[PDB]
Motif scaffolding. Sequence first.
Motif, PDB file in Angstrom:
ATOM      1  N   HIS A 219      75.218  95.250   4.420  1.00 32.93           N
ATOM      2  CA  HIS A 219      73.982  95.298   3.396  1.00 32.93           C
ATOM      3  C   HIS A 219      72.994  96.199   4.180  1.00 32.93           C
ATOM      4  CE1 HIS A 219      75.824  91.808   1.716  1.00 32.93           C
ATOM      5  NE2 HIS A 219      75.965  91.170   3.067  1.00 32.93           N
ATOM      6  N   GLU A 220      73.574  97.518   4.641  1.00 36.53           N
ATOM      7  CA  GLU A 220      72.354  98.431   5.243  1.00 36.53           C
ATOM      8  C   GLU A 220      72.290  99.566   4.218  1.00 36.53           C
ATOM      9  OE1 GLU A 220      73.753  99.328   9.349  1.00 36.53           O
ATOM     10  OE2 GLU A 220      73.663  97.320   9.984  1.00 36.53           O
ATOM     11  N   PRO A 221      70.872  99.917   3.968  1.00 35.11           N
ATOM     12  CA  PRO A 221      71.021 100.922   3.286  1.00 35.11           C
ATOM     13  C   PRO A 221      71.632 102.348   3.705  1.00 35.11           C
ATOM     14  CG  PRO A 221      68.851 100.559   4.117  1.00 35.11           C
ATOM     15  CD  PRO A 221      69.795  99.256   4.445  1.00 35.11           C
ATOM     16  N   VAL A 222      72.289 103.002   2.933  1.00 35.43           N
ATOM     17  CA  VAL A 222      72.986 104.150   3.416  1.00 35.43           C
ATOM     18  C   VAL A 222      72.573 105.433   2.323  1.00 35.43           C
ATOM     19  CG1 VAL A 222      75.341 105.128   3.769  1.00 35.43           C
ATOM     20  CG2 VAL A 222      74.955 102.916   3.967  1.00 35.43           C
ATOM     21  N   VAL A 223      72.494 105.470   1.267  1.00 36.76           N
ATOM     22  CA  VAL A 223      72.191 106.583   0.541  1.00 36.76           C
ATOM     23  C   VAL A 223      70.807 106.070  -0.457  1.00 36.76           C
ATOM     24  CG1 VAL A 223      72.844 107.985  -1.130  1.00 36.76           C
ATOM     25  CG2 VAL A 223      74.467 107.366   0.392  1.00 36.76           C
ATOM     26  N   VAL A 224      69.755 106.641  -0.489  1.00 36.66           N
ATOM     27  CA  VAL A 224      68.611 106.442  -0.975  1.00 36.66           C
ATOM     28  C   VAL A 224      68.179 107.556  -2.202  1.00 36.66           C
ATOM     29  CG1 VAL A 224      66.285 105.457  -0.696  1.00 36.66           C
ATOM     30  CG2 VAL A 224      67.877 105.067   1.092  1.00 36.66           C
ATOM     31  N   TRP A 225      67.912 106.941  -3.270  1.00 37.31           N
ATOM     32  CA  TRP A 225      67.348 107.774  -4.221  1.00 37.31           C
ATOM     33  C   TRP A 225      65.615 107.657  -4.402  1.00 37.31           C
ATOM     34  CZ3 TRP A 225      72.215 105.907  -4.601  1.00 37.31           C
ATOM     35  CH2 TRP A 225      73.173 106.800  -4.853  1.00 37.31           C
ATOM     36  N   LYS A 226      64.847 108.355  -4.303  1.00 35.12           N
ATOM     37  CA  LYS A 226      63.512 108.122  -4.405  1.00 35.12           C
ATOM     38  C   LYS A 226      62.930 108.932  -5.591  1.00 35.12           C
ATOM     39  CE  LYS A 226      62.787 107.860   0.473  1.00 35.12           C
ATOM     40  NZ  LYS A 226      62.085 108.572   1.500  1.00 35.12           N
ATOM     41  N   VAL A 227      62.457 108.220  -6.772  1.00 32.56           N
ATOM     42  CA  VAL A 227      61.963 108.930  -7.942  1.00 32.56           C
ATOM     43  C   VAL A 227      60.529 108.770  -8.091  1.00 32.56           C
ATOM     44  CG1 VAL A 227      62.384 108.669 -10.386  1.00 32.56           C
ATOM     45  CG2 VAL A 227      64.100 107.512  -8.869  1.00 32.56           C
ATOM     46  N   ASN A 228      59.968 110.002  -8.852  1.00 33.24           N
ATOM     47  CA  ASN A 228      58.720 109.959  -8.697  1.00 33.24           C
ATOM     48  C   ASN A 228      57.805 109.926 -10.103  1.00 33.24           C
ATOM     49  OD1 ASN A 228      56.203 110.411  -7.743  1.00 33.24           O
ATOM     50  ND2 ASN A 228      56.151 112.599  -7.304  1.00 33.24           N
ATOM     51  N   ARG A 229      56.767 109.013 -10.268  1.00 34.70           N
ATOM     52  CA  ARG A 229      56.069 108.727 -11.480  1.00 34.70           C
ATOM     53  C   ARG A 229      57.119 108.630 -12.631  1.00 34.70           C
ATOM     54  NH1 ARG A 229      51.011 108.791  -9.610  1.00 34.70           N
ATOM     55  NH2 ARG A 229      50.321 109.318 -11.824  1.00 34.70           N
ATOM     56  N   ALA A 230      57.590 107.233 -12.656  1.00 33.97           N
ATOM     57  CA  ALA A 230      58.523 106.968 -13.898  1.00 33.97           C
ATOM     58  C   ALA A 230      57.909 106.068 -14.821  1.00 33.97           C
ATOM     59  CB  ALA A 230      59.761 106.420 -13.329  1.00 33.97           C
ATOM     60  N   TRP A 231      57.858 106.233 -16.046  1.00 33.17           N
ATOM     61  CA  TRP A 231      57.575 105.309 -16.997  1.00 33.17           C
ATOM     62  C   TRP A 231      58.540 105.097 -18.148  1.00 33.17           C
ATOM     63  CZ3 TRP A 231      56.730 107.827 -21.645  1.00 33.17           C
ATOM     64  CH2 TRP A 231      56.632 109.161 -21.608  1.00 33.17           C
ATOM     65  N   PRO A 232      58.780 103.830 -18.637  1.00 43.09           N
ATOM     66  CA  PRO A 232      59.810 103.855 -19.681  1.00 43.09           C
ATOM     67  C   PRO A 232      59.629 104.297 -20.819  1.00 43.09           C
ATOM     68  CG  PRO A 232      58.539 101.659 -19.541  1.00 43.09           C
ATOM     69  CD  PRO A 232      57.809 102.530 -18.475  1.00 43.09           C
ATOM     70  N   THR A 233      60.492 105.102 -21.380  1.00 45.47           N
ATOM     71  CA  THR A 233      60.451 105.675 -22.732  1.00 45.47           C
ATOM     72  C   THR A 233      61.271 104.910 -23.738  1.00 45.47           C
ATOM     73  OG1 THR A 233      60.260 107.773 -21.925  1.00 45.47           O
ATOM     74  CG2 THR A 233      61.084 107.542 -24.034  1.00 45.47           C
ATOM     75  N   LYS A 234      62.393 104.068 -23.490  1.00 53.62           N
ATOM     76  CA  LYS A 234      62.986 103.462 -24.361  1.00 53.62           C
ATOM     77  C   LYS A 234      63.478 101.964 -23.907  1.00 53.62           C
ATOM     78  CE  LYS A 234      65.576 106.176 -26.585  1.00 53.62           C
ATOM     79  NZ  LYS A 234      66.732 107.062 -26.826  1.00 53.62           N
TER      80      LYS A 234
ATOM     81  N   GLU B 286      70.915  94.004 -21.883  1.00 51.24           N
ATOM     82  CA  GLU B 286      69.883  94.986 -22.512  1.00 51.24           C
ATOM     83  C   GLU B 286      69.698  96.198 -21.657  1.00 51.24           C
ATOM     84  OE1 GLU B 286      66.208  92.703 -21.994  1.00 51.24           O
ATOM     85  OE2 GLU B 286      66.560  92.317 -20.346  1.00 51.24           O
ATOM     86  N   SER B 287      69.072  97.385 -22.052  1.00 57.08           N
ATOM     87  CA  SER B 287      68.866  98.627 -21.579  1.00 57.08           C
ATOM     88  C   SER B 287      67.746  99.221 -21.445  1.00 57.08           C
ATOM     89  CB  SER B 287      69.988  99.577 -22.152  1.00 57.08           C
ATOM     90  OG  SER B 287      71.174  98.713 -22.169  1.00 57.08           O
ATOM     91  N   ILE B 288      67.213  99.867 -20.532  1.00 48.11           N
ATOM     92  CA  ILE B 288      65.965 100.766 -20.354  1.00 48.11           C
ATOM     93  C   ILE B 288      66.267 102.187 -20.089  1.00 48.11           C
ATOM     94  CG2 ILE B 288      65.411 100.364 -18.046  1.00 48.11           C
ATOM     95  CD1 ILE B 288      62.494  99.894 -19.144  1.00 48.11           C
ATOM     96  N   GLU B 289      65.540 102.989 -20.635  1.00 48.16           N
ATOM     97  CA  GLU B 289      65.577 104.498 -20.302  1.00 48.16           C
ATOM     98  C   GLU B 289      64.294 105.017 -19.868  1.00 48.16           C
ATOM     99  OE1 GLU B 289      68.036 106.714 -22.987  1.00 48.16           O
ATOM    100  OE2 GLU B 289      66.816 108.667 -22.690  1.00 48.16           O
ATOM    101  N   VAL B 290      64.250 105.727 -18.697  1.00 50.21           N
ATOM    102  CA  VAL B 290      62.938 106.106 -17.920  1.00 50.21           C
ATOM    103  C   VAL B 290      62.954 107.719 -17.810  1.00 50.21           C
ATOM    104  CG1 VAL B 290      61.636 105.597 -15.796  1.00 50.21           C
ATOM    105  CG2 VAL B 290      63.061 103.767 -16.730  1.00 50.21           C
ATOM    106  N   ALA B 291      61.902 107.941 -17.865  1.00 51.52           N
ATOM    107  CA  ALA B 291      61.392 109.429 -17.799  1.00 51.52           C
ATOM    108  C   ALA B 291      60.665 109.395 -16.031  1.00 51.52           C
ATOM    109  CB  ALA B 291      60.543 110.047 -18.561  1.00 51.52           C
TER     110      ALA B 291
END
Lengths: 142, 142
Positions: free
Chosen positions: A97-112, A128-133
Amino acid sequence: AEYPLPKFHFQVDWGGSRLGFTEVSGLDVETEVIEYREGNLPQYHKLKMPGMQKFSNITMKRGTFQGDNDFYKWWNTVALNTIERRDLTISLLNEKHEPVVVWKVNRAWPTKVQSTDLKGDGNEVAIESIEVAHEGLTIQNG
Amino acid sequence: AEYPLPKFHFQVDWGGSRLGFTEVSGLDVETEVIEYREGNLPQYHKLKMPGMQKFSNITMKRGTFQGDNDFYKWWNTVALNTIERRDLTISLLNEKHEPVVVWKVNRAWPTKVQSTDLKGDGNEVAIESIEVAHEGLTIQNG
């Protein structure tokens, strides 16, 4: 460190109450090509150079539980052109359980937001599903 | 019979070596109208009768070959108000390589010559054009 990694043990920080997502897709980056050629060049094909950047929307899917209405909660914070933006973090974990690969997203708000469909003969869980910009993405490995 | 002719098999006699063009347009004839009415005529619109004739300039387009400089050759034979005039013949050919419709053009001399344009990204053949003035035209069919 010597073995290749699997793709079924991960976690998502999204400023939401619960966790445990099923699917996460959409992690890409791109740059446009610009082409150029002048009349007297001895080769008869074009030269190429970098242009502008492009980022994709991110999709997440999870199962439905009694009492949890978080996707709708986030989507419904939208005024005329204002909304609540959040920092998103996605991490892939290994056996210990050690973080190996990290993706950092900037300014995300849900569009759908999409809810499940109802079938009188469906032997499956409701999902259920969500779509984010967002306005940025960064990869960190090792 | 019951079938008409197509529009893609023709030839031009103009005094130059090559006998193949890609476009030939401008074959028209016209007469002006003169109108007349006197005050006591029971109809309140005019009478019409024929006047003078009018002919159009003719345009021809062809592809460019190494060693062939004929359009320029003909155009460049111009002194102050003298030039070399030629008889022009245009024919629409049939299966047996013969003529069916013939246009005879009288006293033609080239008024304009246009060369191709050069594009570093153009995947097309180079084409040139000529525009010709004349003092007569006659149609012969059958």
